[PDB]
């Protein structure tokens, strides 16, 4: 409960870890791992409204949450080299289950104003879409 | 901060003897601390979130903590530590050359094959 491994917001999963070092048997101790999942009961399968029924199957692959797909910097001798960090980082494409408080989500709807139709744009999460 | 890009920039060195003090080494309005004549320059590239300052001709005296100031409304002060390690410079020029009174000049400057793309 003390060190955070992943906090992923496209699927709303969080994984922490801790060593519970006790006193009796002072040679063995345990390693605990906590996983928290929040399940949205009223979202759609694609995040655009009219598409599909509400999602009923949620699938978490812990080898995909845990991965790191970005370069990093290492100093080997007297140098700065750029390295990768994983064996599986080829192609976003991952389907998102929840929203994310810091991102707009907009849609497009046609309506009528006497003559022509229009291309009205519509906010799906109204707190995040003010133009500022 | 990007919303105060029309400011003045400073570069001070931590003295740290009595209580702590920043003597100003260089500024944006064109004033150099006279002991640093020839080996200090503050530049404005890349702009838009950052700026650079270049300190060369290093001796082992320059190992210290350095601070950066601006006259903006909000004051981020960031600390950089310069260490000194063993090695030799990648570029190569001779010792400080002379010239004749009234005749041509040429000065080389090597660079290794890591700096061929640049």
């Amino acid at each position: 409960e003390r060190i955070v491994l992943v906090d992923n917001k496209c699927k709303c999963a969080r994984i922490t870890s801790r060593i519970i070092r006790s006193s009796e048997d002072p040679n063995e101790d345990i390693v605990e791992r906590n996983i928290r999942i929040i399940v949205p009961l009223n979202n759609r399968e694609n995040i655009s409204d009219p598409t599909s029924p509400l999602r009923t199957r949620f699938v978490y692959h812990l080898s995909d949450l845990c991965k790191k797909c970005d370069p990093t910097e290492v100093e080997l001798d007297n140098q700065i080299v750029t390295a990768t960090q994983s064996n599986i980082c080829d192609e976003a494409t991952e389907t998102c289950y929840t929203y994310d408080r810091n991102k707009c989500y907009t849609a497009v709807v046609p309506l009528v104003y006497g003559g022509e139709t229009k291309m009205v744009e519509t906010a799906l999460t109204p707190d995040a879409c003010y133009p500022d | 901060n990007r919303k105060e890009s029309k400011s003045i920039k400073y570069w001070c060195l931590w003295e740290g003897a009595q209580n702590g003090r920043c003597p100003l080494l260089v500024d944006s309005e064109g004033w150099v601390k006279a002991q640093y004549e020839g080996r200090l320059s503050l530049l404005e590239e890349p702009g838009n979130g950052t700026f650079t300052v270049i300190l060369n001709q290093l001796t082992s005296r320059d190992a210290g903590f350095y601070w950066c100031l601006t006259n903006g409304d909000t004051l981020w002060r960031t600390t950089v530590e310069i260490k000194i390690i063993e090695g030799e410079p990648n570029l190569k020029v001779p010792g400080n050359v002379t010239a004749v009174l009234g005749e041509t000049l040429k000065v080389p400057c090597h660079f290794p094959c890591k700096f061929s793309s640049y």
């Binding site: 060190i3 491994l5 917001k9 709303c12 870890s17 801790r18 060593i19 519970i20 040679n27 063995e28 345990i30 390693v31 605990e32 791992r33 906590n34 996983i35 928290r36 999942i37 929040i38 399940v39 949205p40 009961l41 009223n42 979202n43 370069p71 990093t72 290492v74 100093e75 080997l76 001798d77 140098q79 080299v81 750029t82 390295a83 990768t84 960090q85 994983s86 064996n87 929840t98 929203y99 994310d100 408080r101 999460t125 | 290794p112 094959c113 890591k114 061929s116 793309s117």
Partner: protein, 231 residues
Amino acid sequence: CHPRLSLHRPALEDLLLGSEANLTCTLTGLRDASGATFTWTPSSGKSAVQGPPERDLCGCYSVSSVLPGCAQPWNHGETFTCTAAHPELKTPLTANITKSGNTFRPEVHLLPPPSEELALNELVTLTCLARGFSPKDVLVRWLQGSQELPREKYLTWASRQEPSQGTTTYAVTSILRVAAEDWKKGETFSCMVGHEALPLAFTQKTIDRLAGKPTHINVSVVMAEADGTCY
């Protein structure tokens, strides 16, 4: 008692971390290696400096000459075709070199310490394993935190070809022995493997005690009818 001429590639250490890809053209088995000349098919920094005739098996002469140049054209795919103008024969022999093709890229894994070493409480072993790569050259280093460990603290084996599931691929291994106190305290260790088929020429894996196989697992599933936002 017999001439035979070969061409050796550049190394991996000086061409990945640096770029100074010197070449070397040298045969051994001559008769009268005192005055001789060498050919290289392009030349820019033409000071291909000579050297001393280091003897070899059963004491015959050996030439010595280095060709400079760095790692932009060898990366672009050029060719070099050194051959000899010997003082000992009448019609020369040809050899050339190019960048290698049909390359696979490796797979890196780090393996945690075994269980029975953690009870004895003296020193533990890490094992770095790199697999499936077609050219036979590789680099393996080690890091503690962000500090490179010096080379005398770890043992690394050679590169050998694995059993053939169709095409010829290779393997390598390495180990490092550290203290059980600072593995239990929480220091982190890395094994960095560099091979030329990889896109950024390097790849890294990091391992510590907290990010490993657990003994306890707690799972919480919270059903949220309120909103679908994930704060």
